[PDB]
Amino acid sequence: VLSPADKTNVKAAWGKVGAHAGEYGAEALERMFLSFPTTKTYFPHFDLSHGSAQVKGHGKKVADALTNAVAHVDDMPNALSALSDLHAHKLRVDPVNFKLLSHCLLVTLAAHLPAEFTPAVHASLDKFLASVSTVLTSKYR
Amino acid sequence: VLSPADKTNVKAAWGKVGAHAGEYGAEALERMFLSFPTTKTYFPHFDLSHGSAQVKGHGKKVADALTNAVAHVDDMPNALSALSDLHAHKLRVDPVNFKLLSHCLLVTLAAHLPAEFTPAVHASLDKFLASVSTVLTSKYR
Amino acid sequence: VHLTPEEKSAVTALWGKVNVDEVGGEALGRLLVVYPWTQRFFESFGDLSTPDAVMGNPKVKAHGKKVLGAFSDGLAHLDNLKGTFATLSELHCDKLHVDPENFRLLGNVLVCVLAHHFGKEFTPPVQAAYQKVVAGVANALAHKYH
Amino acid sequence: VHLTPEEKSAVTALWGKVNVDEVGGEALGRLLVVYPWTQRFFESFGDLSTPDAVMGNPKVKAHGKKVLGAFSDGLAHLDNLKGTFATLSELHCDKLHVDPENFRLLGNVLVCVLAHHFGKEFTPPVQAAYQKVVAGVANALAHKYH
Ligand code: HEM
Ligand code: HEM
Ligand code: HEM
Ligand code: HEM
Ligand SMILES: CCCCCCCCCCCCC/C=C\[C@@H](O)[C@@H](N)COP(=O)(O)O
Ligand SMILES: O=C(O)[C@@H](COP(=O)(O)O)OP(=O)(O)O
């Protein structure tokens, strides 16, 4: 569960992301594909080369979903309902992969938010991404 | 989340386990220690030899907690509250280990329940043990 | 894999009592029932909507025999699993796009199936030997991923 | 998957710019804050009740420096990680009773700290090389467990 402190920490850090959201999402994806190539098994229909427009486009979608989750942190299950339906019934990404993208998102944030990425915020963001991952895999079976 | 059918399946299988719960808990522990040696790091104070009284005693405790969870299957977070506090604040067993003991419990039940360990029951018991594990690590941070 | 001579013998002694075709169908079928997201690679297999629909699905059974038949042949080459599974590794990555985590889940389902079928004979030490085997096979199938 | 010559060069070039004292303290500190259950091995270190107490704790900093110091020395043996960490592996298992999963969590935290410190220079390719490095080190420290 996310404590009041976690919510405040997440809102502050993500708020700083601002117009860079799509950029950071795309960067996080690239880091994941390079660091953990098995995650590429889910995007055989994508050009995964650097600068790929498909990756950039997907990075934006992922970032917007996270923004939506932050804005509705008190009720993420309902806010992300269609998204959890999509991953459970269609995409069916193995649950093990979510921590991989979560880790890469954290790395991306650390690389771009030197002042805001304090140990407490890092902890809050890790918990937050875990919560989002849990909601997204909640309908799997 | 456990569906009505999942609960019917768990109650049927655990009901057949009956008086052998403690023995099965002990067997599950022996299987875990042998197949996944790293789990032994949590029991340096134990005589982990085959048939040791400490493993038998601990197996009984684990099995009893599972029996309690089954008896309160629609209220597990509350029924396992004290146990969740204990693992989170004191024992602090890394979360990755719960799937290891759960796997060994399933193996133990498969080896002892030839008639009832059907594919559907297997599926329901895997979800049940995952639910119990989630509850037991829910207060970790 | 790091099996002791006594574990390699245990593995082979038990496997010689296994009906590979049957166990293959049972393990693949249980994988699809227990972890339903794995059905994502079998959209051409037809009805997989209920446990019986999956377990008795003739294509699931046929594929199970193919999969475990290869696993079985791999057991005759425990000292060279990466080499023996090299082309199947390349195929699963480049053509089938199968997340290697699926090999690990199948391995755990296989261990549960062996315990179910053999009962008490599937002792704790015997299980430990088989856990090393399924992990080794899974690692060999994941080796050529890139 | 080991390191390509280029990846090895990437690792060493970045590491030559690392203040191991600071990165070590920061890494262990963040480990105890982000995954608090890891505090179970350090009850004699004193106050670890808040993020500031953990990061400022002198024993946490002293231990972070010791641990990362050993990690640093290991980087000179990238071709024989198991051999160079063998005694430490046996020690963490037999005397310290440290679940090797802890090595993987520290690895994750270390990557985040390197990214925090280097910013844009910690590029995706550089991250990938370091991910191979921390996995290899964790695997080496876990190798002698029994
Ligand atoms: C932080 C967790 C994640 C979030 C917030 C997330 C969010 C999303 C969103 C917003 C979409 C677009 C849906 C649409 O078209 O309307 C999507 C699609 C998808 N996601 Fe997830 N996702 C996450 C993790 C994952 C992971 C771990 C993978 C796999 C490694 C993954 C693979 C996919 C794939 C393959 C698609 C389809 C993209 C396409 O075909 O264009 N997702 N996800
Ligand atoms: C199926 C999930 C699990 C259940 C139901 C469970 C249940 C319990 C129970 C009932 C106790 C006794 C508490 C008391 O004395 O009141 C306990 C203690 C303990 N558990 Fe858990 N546990 C689970 C998983 C784990 C795992 C995965 C590990 C580590 C591999 C673990 C390690 C311990 C340790 C070391 C203790 C203390 C034993 C002692 O000092 O006597 N538990 N657990
Ligand atoms: C012990 C591990 C496994 C072995 C040894 C194995 C072996 C094989 C073999 C021999 C084939 C035929 C290759 C061909 O068509 O040329 C095959 C095909 C295939 N395998 Fe694997 N496999 C394993 C695990 C899995 C798992 C767990 C999945 C995913 C849930 C999977 C999905 C597939 C798919 C989709 C095909 C193609 C089926 C089709 O023809 O439509 N495999 N595998
Ligand atoms: C990169 C991984 C790590 C390396 C290379 C490493 C290295 C070391 C070294 C060099 C020592 C001194 C051994 C001696 O006395 O001869 C040590 C002690 C210790 N390490 Fe590790 N370690 C690592 C990760 C960890 C982690 C993640 C934990 C647990 C969260 C841990 C817990 C301990 C403990 C409790 C001690 C004993 C401290 C004391 O003397 O009070 N280590 N480690
Ligand atoms: C020669 C025999 C060929 C048949 C073998 C079948 C292999 C199955 C294909 C593996 C799928 C690659 C992953 C594709 C991406 C998906 O995650 C989503 N785009 C769509 O969801 P989703 O497609 O998962 O619903
Ligand atoms: O050093 C190595 O070649 C292997 C040892 O494993 P085995 O080949 O003995 O199974 O390391 P790993 O690929 O597991 O990281």
Numbering used by the authors:
A (entry chain A), B (entry chain C): 1 to 141
C (entry chain D), D (entry chain B): 1 to 146
Question: What did the original publication write about this model?
Answer:
Expectedly, and consistent with published studies, we observed 2,3-BPG bound in two alternate conformations at the dyad axis of the β-cleft in the ternary deoxyHbA-S1P-2,3-BPG complex to tie together the two β-subunits via interactions with the residues βHis2, βLys82, βAsn139, and βHis143 from both β-subunits (intermolecular interactions) in symmetry-related fashion. In both the binary deoxyHbA-S1P and ternary deoxyHbA-S1P-2,3-BPG complexes, S1P was observed bound in the central water cavity, with the phosphate and the amide moieties located in a pocket formed by α1Lys99, α1His103, β1Asn108, β1Tyr35 and β1Gln131, while the flexible aliphatic long chain snaked toward the β-cleft making hydrophobic interactions with α1 Phe36, α1Ser35, β1Lys132, β1Gln131, β1Ala135, β1Val1 and β1His2. Binding of 2,3-BPG might have increased the affinity of the protein for S1P in the central water cavity. Interestingly, besides the central water cavity bound S1P we also found two additional S1P molecules bound in a symmetry-related fashion at the surface of the deoxyHbA-S1P-2,3-BPG complex but not in the deoxyHbA-S1P complex, indicating that 2,3-BPG binding most likely is required for S1P binding at the surface of the protein. Specifically, the phosphate moiety binds close to the α1-heme and located in a highly positive environment formed by α1Arg92, β2Arg40, α1His45, and α1Lys90, as well as with β2Glu43; either making direct salt-bridge/hydrogen-bond interactions and/or water-mediated hydrogen-bond interactions with these residues. The side-chains of both β2Glu43 and α1Lys90 have moved from their native positions to make interactions with the S1P. The highly flexible aliphatic chain snaked along a shallow cavity wall making hydrophobic interactions with the so-called “switch region” residues of β2Phe41, α1Thr41, α1Pro44, β2Leu96, β2His97, as well as with β2-heme, like a molecular sticky tape.
